[PDB]
């Protein structure tokens, strides 16, 4: 328990939602950090170089999740609980359209310009971007589909189901390559590398899975029964990044030794890690958004280079 | 079909040419075909 964590004077001004923050995400270049919050659903982007918010754009409905299509802040897609997808260009709002059934989560395949809708229908909707026409439907034959992920290594699409069955599909030729069998619902599913996959369960168990072997490589159970919303992977220290609302746990991929655990004052909606840095950004059910810096995990980010002097 | 409950394939003008296809996959097409046949117990 010798990590001795810091908590943060003000790195970025007005890094505060009005009441709560649902999702926080970072652009691939790392210059833009995006966050959305209640009330009056906003899209607030903060400049790393300027340490200030570039703009705010209010929305009609609360956004369950948003994904950054472009390398810069230019192009963004929002999925709503009102079945609505809103497209925002660089200037502002660009186009809006609905889906027949509610969408739990969505993932975009950068190859083929195909964007996938996973939701409250057994069929998984597909969206082509280069061509406006909606593509052919694919039937996952399970009543409710909860989560989805696409692997960057070789383009594998897998969708979670309510029964607890993970179903893998092929983005090309639209065929179900295989099935994985494992009452608890699939809370979180992440692809890391070619052959490593993780499944979160509502009971609080995050399970490591390998593609070729049905049996799990390792099992880690959170003692608290709350579901694990988000799981991340850190390659440098081989750490698997597991977060639930009560607490977030840092543990090694092999042998499952625990690195450290962080419990904040109020629950975490979402957790994010800045690339190649020990700085951690967490979204809480609080107007302030958490910023935590772990020196042992990694060095300070470049736009916050002076923290290493301050420690 | 009310309120867009049924899927329709009419052309969407505003979304036309919204992105350009960019591909960065190292694995070659012959290697891709062999892997998918070999996936899981198959």
């Amino acid at each position: 328990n010798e990590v001795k964590i810091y908590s943060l004077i003000e790195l970025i001004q007005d890094f505060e939602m009005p009441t709560v923050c649902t999702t926080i995400k970072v652009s691939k270049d790392g210059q833009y950090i995006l966050a959305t919050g209640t009330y009056k659903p906003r899209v607030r982007c903060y400049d790393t170089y300027q340490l200030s918010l570039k703009f705010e754009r209010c929305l009609d409905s609360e956004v369950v999740t948003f994904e950054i299509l472009s390398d810069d802040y230019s192009k963004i897609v929002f999925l709503h609980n009102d079945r609505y997808i809103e497209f925002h260009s660089q200037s502002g709002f660009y186009y809006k359209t609905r889906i027949p059934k509610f969408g739990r989560d969505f993932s975009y395949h950068y190859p083929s310009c195909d964007l996938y809708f996973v939701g409250a229908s057994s069929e998984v909707y597909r969206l082509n971007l280069e061509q406006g026409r909606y593509l052919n439907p694919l039937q996952t034959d399970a009543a409710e589909n909860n989560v989805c992920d696409i692997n960057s290594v070789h383009g594998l699409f897998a969708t979670g189901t309510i029964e607890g069955r993970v179903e893998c599909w092929d983005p090309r030729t639209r065929n179900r390559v295989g099935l994985l069998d494992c009452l608890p619902t699939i809370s979180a599913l992440k692809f890391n590398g070619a052959l490593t996959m993780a499944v979160g369960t509502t009971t609080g168990q995050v399970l490591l899975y390998d593609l070729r072997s049905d049996k799990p490589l390792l099992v880690k159970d959170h003692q608290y029964g709350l579901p694990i919303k988000s799981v991340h992977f850190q390659d440098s220290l081989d750490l698997i990044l597991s977060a639930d609302s009560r607490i977030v746990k840092m543990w090694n991929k092999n042998s499952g030794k625990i690195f450290t655990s962080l419990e904040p004052e109020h629950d975490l909606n979402d957790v994010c890690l800045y690339p190649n840095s020990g700085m951690l950004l967490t979204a809480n059910e609080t107007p302030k958004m958490g910023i935590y810096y772990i020196p042992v995990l990694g060095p300070a980010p470049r736009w916050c280079s002076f923290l290493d002097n301050l420690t | 079909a009310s309120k867009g409950r049924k899927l329709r394939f009419h052309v969407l003008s505003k979304l036309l040419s919204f992105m350009a296809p960019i591909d960065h996959t190292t694995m070659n097409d012959d290697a891709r075909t062999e892997l998918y046949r070999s996936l899981f117990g198959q």
Partner: peptide
């Protein structure tokens, strides 16, 4: 026809 699904051919 509005509900007919288009078909593609592998190139």
């Amino acid at each position: 026809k509005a509900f007919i699904p288009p078909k593609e051919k592998p190139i």
